[model samples]
Target chain A: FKAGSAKKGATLFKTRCLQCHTVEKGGPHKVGPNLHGIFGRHSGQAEGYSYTDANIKKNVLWDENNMSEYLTNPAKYIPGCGMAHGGLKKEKDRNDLITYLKKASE
Target chain B: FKAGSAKKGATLFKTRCLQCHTVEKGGPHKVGPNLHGIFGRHSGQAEGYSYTDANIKKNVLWDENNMSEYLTNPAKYIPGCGMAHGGLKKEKDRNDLITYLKKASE
Candidate 1:
């Protein structure tokens, strides 16, 4: 079972992604886009936020599989993408963060 | 002179604080407050952001001295503070990050 801990993921989100992404609906876009309802969307499609041409051109869909790949190494997944995160190296952390995102967005 | 490497600091900022902080003027506030002009202000004073009561009541200024202490251990500095960072254990990282913030804010 690859189930993750959303509780721990919340803490990780605060320390990691909260600086750039907001999981809440109607949240303002910051350095990065608001990540509300991100799971089913295409990359670089968040409204009112500017994204790199590379990110837009990747034409990738957002799902647990694709997102986990990207989160493993953003630069490697989509070179020239503007997001600067170094990537979450831990599989468990990625699973947990994804769970938190899915739950919070619902 | 414990002068820090602003170049390295910039990378660290992207990896660490960029998720929440924006050093450029008029940058949008993320999950945390926008950190522009942070050095001269009191803790928890960024406009349009809500801070914890503990942070507001701490009455601490954001000079190098005080901030260094806080960055070393935010929970210890202001118990019940809303910031979730575990704190920068390496003094050099803190110094470099501060230098980066000062220059970017200026």
Candidate 2:
């Protein structure tokens, strides 16, 4: 995977992802599942969050490869994901976002 | 599978199943997908019909086993399915319905 600036990624996350997800451990779930510990966790394991069947049935390890693909285009990647965020089109944006996600989710 | 009378099942279909589904080949799509070739076909394969993610993702060959289970409880069988019909509770009802479905869909 290409290296990215976590600082730059933070800006992207703040604007695009924060409305629905919270990166801090034990942070509250918004429209989307709280993404704390997302990388190692399986899809749809976030407690108390009601996920659409699309997300629940996907059931995969949430590693960088899958996360990057999902961040690229959630609807395209998962087909029926309910997240409303139009994907970040740039490779740099994806790399940076995942970089920040790797750091923030820990 | 228990053999059931198609004659009895026809009454059940006219009352309960006909509102959304049509058993005849090339039947028009009502609220649900046309179930003309349902027994041999996979779930969510009816052309031009819109299926929920639950049904499409649950891509399985329709057979007596799967069909009976689904007829017992649709919401339980495939959560997020758009079909509003409450499932037939009696095993006889399910058996009869599948018996009729086999004859009519052909």
Candidate 3:
């Protein structure tokens, strides 16, 4: 479930993740954390942003496995996770997009 | 001077071309044509659409060089080309974006 279609994932992230995260500066922030350096970080440790108890308690991490599972079913992985996106269903799509996100955030 | 930063250009196009051209059926067509098979076709031949007199008069073909120049400076290249874009000043940027357009339109 590692949504890592780098090219397609880049497309999906621009259209999707851009709503909430700021991969680079000048990007807007909506609801979630700014993923400037999210790959090796904890799940809910974005500075200056408040995380819900559910997210912090879930003990999630931004590594490949966690990102893969969370993207496939955000609600299922962290029920009450405040992210409003309906999880991406296609496994390849999720992996590709996650790969894109990881690359972009770097 | 062929600009082919495919990756960066793809990003630029998603944020730019998407306003008018519809590479996919679900996409919206604002002022431009639905770019299905736009490559290797006559410049202003998108059916059921009106081309500005300037565009047709220029008799531009959708070849790589013409597209590159047109994208770099729509006004300079086509005089009264009806596209409202100010033209991408960066040659590499325009080249890469046109490459993306060619691929996406396919």
In candidate 3, list every pair of residues with a backbone clash: A2-A95, A3-A94, A3-A95, A3-A96, A4-A95, A4-A96, A5-A96
Mind giving the per-residue lDDT tens digits that candidate 3 earns over A49-99?
444456654657678777777678644221122234535777877888877
For model 1, how does the per-residue alpha-carbon lDDT over A1-106 read when each residue is reduced to its tens digit?
1659999988878888775556788766543567788876888776555454576557578888777777786332212122255368888888998888887875
Q: Is candidate 2 or candidate 3 better by lDDT?
A: 2
Cα error of candidate 3 at position A95, Å: 1.1
Q: Give the interface RMSD values of the models in order.
A: 9.9, 16.0, 20.1
Q: What is the DockQ of each candidate?
A: 0.04, 0.02, 0.01
Candidate 1, residue A14: the lDDT equals 84
Instruction: List the candidate numbers ranked by TM-score, top first.
Output: 1, 2, 3
What digit string (tens of lDDT, one per residue) describes model 2 on residues B11-94?
889888775567787765543556788887898777544344566547888899788887787332212222345468889999
| Candidate 1, residue B10: lDDT | 93
**Alpha-carbon runs more than 4 Å astray in model 2:** A1-106, B74-83
How many residue pairs clash in all the candidates, one count each?
Answer: 3, 0, 7
Q: Evaluated with DockQ, which candidate comes out highest?
A: 1
- Model 3 residue B88 lDDT? 78
The true-versus-predicted C-alpha distance at residue A8 of model 1, in Å, is 30
C-alpha lDDT of all candidate models, in order: 0.67, 0.69, 0.60
How far off is residue A71 in model 1, in Å? 25
